Write a protein that binds this ligand. Structure first.
Ligand SMILES: [Mg+2]
Length: 211
RNA sequence: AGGCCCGGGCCGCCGGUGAAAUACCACUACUCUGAUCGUUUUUUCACUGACCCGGUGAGGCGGGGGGGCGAGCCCCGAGG
């Protein structure tokens, strides 16, 4: 506990701020051990955090008549089916969208449009839209949900994701790490056994080596 | 979203492009190399003395000597 998480916290406070002008976002860098990536089940997970957004902005864009109205209401982006279809030109416009929009939403438009009318590419970028809108929620809550941490294992024995903000500093911080490190252990094939090291990195340099 | 200038400096997340990169930072993974007699793990070959087998009334084995009917080679005084 305090032996392990408090010591490293203090390092970030003394270091970091003075080290680099401008503030980035902390990320939890993990290293697996004694695991076979392609010969064994891939563990994919998605969990919430307390009340802090890891991504700075660009929450999501939706596609539906009413959701687009509520979109112009509280959200900057309100794309619609007919506006969305750009065909072959979309390939590059959608690559730009993947570079921009951190996430995407769709009220039943995604079921048919992305495989067909929108096209592929969102999957290639790893960002397919979510059916989080179903005419049964308010998009403010959906935007609060889009500020989470998502896990999927790949060939590299390491998955790194937004775990904190240099600008936001509270005990809650590590409580997000505590939630995150446990969440991997929960969905890992055989628990803590296959974790070689854990790292929390913010901005530039190497500030943490948990376990 | 050039870290990095003397109170005025540049790589690129610019645009393209490829299936994904082109600042900056990390994180691994793998292939190679020296070191650590640090940890163990093993493979081949050879020996004989345990042990095994066969033969025999356990009858001539091993090394050396001596001699050719000797053979190649040497100063040959054509030769101990
Ligand atoms: Mg005999």
């Amino acid at each position: 506990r305090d032996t392990l998480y408090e010591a490293v916290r203090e390092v970030l406070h003394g270091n970091q701020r003075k080290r680099r002008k401008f503030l980035e976002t902390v990320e939890l860098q993990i290293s697996l051990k004694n695991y076979d990536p392609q010969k064994d089940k891939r563990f994919s997970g998605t969990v919430r955090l307390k009340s802090t957004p890891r991504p700075k902005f660009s929450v999501c864009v939706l596609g539906d008549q009413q959701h687009c109205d509520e979109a112009k209401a509280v959200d900057i982006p309100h794309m619609d089916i007919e506006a969305l279809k750009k065909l072959n030109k979309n390939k590059k416009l959608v690559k730009k969208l993947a570079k921009k929009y951190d996430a995407f939403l769709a009220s039943e438009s995604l079921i048919k449009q992305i495989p067909r009318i929108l096209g592929p590419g969102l999957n290639k970028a790893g960002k397919f839209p979510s059916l989080l809108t179903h005419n049964e929620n308010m998009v403010a809550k959906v935007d609060e949900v889009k500020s989470t941490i998502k896990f999927q294992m790949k060939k590299v024995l390491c998955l790194a994701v937004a775990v904190g903000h240099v600008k936001m500093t509270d005990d809650e911080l590590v409580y997000n790490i505590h939630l995150a490190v446990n969440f991997l252990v929960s969905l890992l094939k055989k628990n803590w056994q296959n974790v070689r090291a854990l790292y929390i990195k913010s901005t530039m340099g190497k500030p943490q080596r948990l376990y």
